[PDB]
RNA sequence: AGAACUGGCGAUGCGGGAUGAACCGAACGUAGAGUUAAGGUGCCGGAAUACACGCUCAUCAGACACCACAAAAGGUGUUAGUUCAUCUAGACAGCCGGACGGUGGCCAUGGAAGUCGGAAUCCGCUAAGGAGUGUGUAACAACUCACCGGCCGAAUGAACUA
RNA sequence: CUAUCUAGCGAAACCACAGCCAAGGGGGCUUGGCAGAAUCAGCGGGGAAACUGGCUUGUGGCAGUCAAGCGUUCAUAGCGACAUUGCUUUUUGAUUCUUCGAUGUCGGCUCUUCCUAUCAUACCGAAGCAGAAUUCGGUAAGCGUUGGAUUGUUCACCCACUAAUAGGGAGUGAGCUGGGUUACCCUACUGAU
């Protein structure tokens, strides 16, 4: 059994993305189905589907880009629900530890939009639950 | 040969086996080189791996600085001292036999060169031709 | 890379044009080809193929059996709880330059030696006990509860076919042996502690260096 | 192709009389067992 | 053909085979039904739905609607005049040719013959039939309905089914991103033609019960009259 | 079990004619003709009349009689291939690199020429057999149609053609591109 | 391995076994003719390419002395059997339809709807339709059996031996 | 200088017969392959210590669990396949100068040729195989498979290069290393009349 479990982790780790956490990065976190796929597509050649269902992106997606003769990476999150901060699925947990570990700017993809029809109280209480982990993070909200 | 090593190689005379001390022409502070190995060879029964001009060789340093001595490193041959042939018709050779050091990608380590170097070597390799004061 | 990327490409493009037909046809062809291999494979591969085919067969027999089975319708104390269950048989070996000084014999068989050996000098010795063939440990199984525990030898009282192999310590089949019981730790009448029991060996040490012993109970 | 070596089908007498002596050993062992 | 046979696929499913016990059981049970009930109706039902039959049965519990295998129904009815439970039954055993299906009532005849003319459902083509509509599929994104409803609310068809569309349905279906697209419009059928099986399947795949469903009957018998009646109403 | 006599029926329609000397056949119909040798198969033929012909074997082993049923279906395939004619349809799909596909004639050779395959420079020619004709699809993108009488020739040619683009050393799940068959129909449409 | 009995060889040739210490046959003066043993009869090679029933077709068969060692078995090669099952009151293959409702059953989860998965095994109508084989989408959906039923009409199938 | 040839002189050793090969027979006989008079010069390979009995190969022992079947009956009189649980010298990518007293022989360089069970090279299949690279597996032995440093117990090695630096037989019982117990007859071969 353990060797086959390790066969699967071999496969998955080969499917893992490539990150240097030290470098100039832009974490992009938002609610589910806000238009992050449209955003990363419009900045960067990465065609993630834009389709309106809850868990569309399940893992951490990268797009590299350039501006002003520099190199940047952009690290979009699968998206988060409340699961209120005591015990949590590993997807949101790795998103949390990405926030915890990577030393670069963090970006909130706000939907001041008719789409993403979860309510603004849900959105803002989610935000309030993620207030304490905004200590040193260089958070930047943008309304979409 | 590896990355950076440009072109192809013609058949030139294989004068130098392993273990012939030759001088060094760069301004590193290394005096001499001792070959232990040649790259890109064939193999024949009790042949010695033979070196020539225009070849990238694995070789140690005997006299020089203490930092670079007695460890194996990549080196280019520049001067044969045994007669080879040009294809535009002449045979030729140098006074003494000589080679320089550089990294495995063929990039020069020193900042200068003494003495004349091989034409084929400088054509095959950019960076000895970049650092070459003298050729033929 | 980086992702569930092939699955994505499947989702967006459909994993080939012609995949389904080939997979279907391949599983059609498998009936003939398995038998082709059963007739072909001159050497060792017919053997593995057949062994393997026998195995999958018998497992499918278990499957039908368990389907039909579905379809038709120990007093131990507490501190032992939580355990998982001459002219012949002699070659004169003449040594030295002048081959008349034989003087020599060799043991080619296993033995237990004891704690202290105090090995005698070279000139007076006649028999040569080598160093490797020295078992301090043996696996003792229990008849009750079938538990295999890897325990030491203390002594050998009985060795068949001689009184000499008793004192030498040869561990062949038929040899009864003085075995420790320390980790099991049974409480006997009076509340004593057991240090020695009797076991009967059940395997030849030569054919395997493991030494299986049934504990006499 | 390279058509490879065969085993023969030749008699090779030692194996014949070895077979006969082996056979008698087998039948002897059978009679020693057959009382049970 | 002792070897070089086909291997028939073995499984561990739960359901087992019926055999002759259920056959003779239903035979004697209809023969029990015969003297008990009074009004008898032979029902040709070619396209049938399990919920429709259960709907009819839970509509009429005082009736009993029975279906089973044909020749045993002919047996239990009696096929000859010489062998029959009651008289004047062989002649109506002749006519019952189709998928039948039978009813035992004691209610009026009038109520049922108007019932089954009133009773109409929506079903599929069930080919060797007509379907009272044609369908062009537009040269765009393809959807679950196939151009019925507006393009905003229909959902595009899943990318699983497309090789079936290429294999069974004979249609060029080319795959851009995750929805499914076509390049030319595809007319499936016309009115006034007997629908083919692939045609019936494509309208099934769209999920279109465009065909009417109404059961016909051919005949009726009454036990107390002991007389046969012939009625083709659809 | 050494069946004594086995036999099958083949149905000649009104239009088509067939001439069978010993184990040679010619089958002629409106679309044209075909021929076939069957000397390797060791059976008997008989007419009864002119809409039905009987094949048969006497003293059959299993192999012999399985061959009987086969030869019937072969001859029926010829019959269909005259009265209907057979028609095989393919598509040539690419992700990045459009195929350039063409027909050429080298001394009357009827080669089929593919270029730009996977960004290659390589030309690949495929022969055409006798008795089969090509058409690239008019008013249908990325599609080619073959039609003929010899079904065996048609299928062999197209099977060759998709056997040419057997892209190698590369993950088939990614390189979905290639040239493949859409379907196997007859020419007619209506009948 | 050990004993006991017996027979062969030893002192002994001949026929056959392709050749031969151990096998099969066989009473040695020289010669003729005849008949045969064991073994054989396509050619070497003297003798039937005899007759006749069957089975076998090996991508290095076998021509074996035999129980005997690889060995118990694999094998969609093949012939014959045994024991069971099905049936014109319609066997098997197939093509067509249904293959349901409570129900998306319980936790379980972001999502779990017969099929990510733990444990349950119901009744309802029923010709028949599982708390549900297998593909499946993120779930759902759709498709397939197992089960019945419509067309066909004919014998077929499981296991086991040899 | 001989070797070689010629003029002259002119032996010996050795000798049952003499000679072509493979399999078989527990140099000659049996079965087969070939063999064409007579001969010259080189040649060094030969010249009255290795299957008891088809040996050997990849998958532990012992005690259990199912028992397919077997025991003409018994399942625990009794056998019993395939699987499977039982520790097997330190359970958390914590980790022993186990090469330490074996008087025992085995260890090494050029060249043929063979086998394949392939290390690369050619073609193929499957692998989460995006590619490049790489792991397994199949056919296949036509070709190829390196240069150095090294011993009171090298033990199994490091160094590098190379596409790789795979494995065994018949070999020097004639040259070499240890703490060490008539190659002149003919044969065939290569050249030559």
PDB file of C-alpha atoms in Angstrom, chain B residues 17 21 34 37 40 55 63 65 75 95 97-98 103 107 111-112 116:
ATOM      1  CA  UNK B  17      48.126  11.928 -25.275  1.00  0.00           C
ATOM      2  CA  UNK B  21      52.477  18.779 -19.494  1.00  0.00           C
ATOM      3  CA  UNK B  34      48.417  18.286 -17.136  1.00  0.00           C
ATOM      4  CA  UNK B  37      41.273  13.074 -20.045  1.00  0.00           C
ATOM      5  CA  UNK B  40      34.339  13.166 -27.232  1.00  0.00           C
ATOM      6  CA  UNK B  55      39.545  19.957 -28.360  1.00  0.00           C
ATOM      7  CA  UNK B  63      51.799  24.637 -11.192  1.00  0.00           C
ATOM      8  CA  UNK B  65      47.911  29.175  -7.875  1.00  0.00           C
ATOM      9  CA  UNK B  75      40.402  23.169 -20.970  1.00  0.00           C
ATOM     10  CA  UNK B  95      57.253  26.118 -30.795  1.00  0.00           C
ATOM     11  CA  UNK B  97      52.527  23.017 -26.604  1.00  0.00           C
ATOM     12  CA  UNK B  98      49.892  24.897 -24.774  1.00  0.00           C
ATOM     13  CA  UNK B 103      34.136  26.385 -18.096  1.00  0.00           C
ATOM     14  CA  UNK B 107      33.424  30.410 -21.767  1.00  0.00           C
ATOM     15  CA  UNK B 111      40.960  37.877 -19.031  1.00  0.00           C
ATOM     16  CA  UNK B 112      43.964  37.684 -21.386  1.00  0.00           C
ATOM     17  CA  UNK B 116      49.559  32.446 -30.854  1.00  0.00           C
TER      18      UNK B 116
END
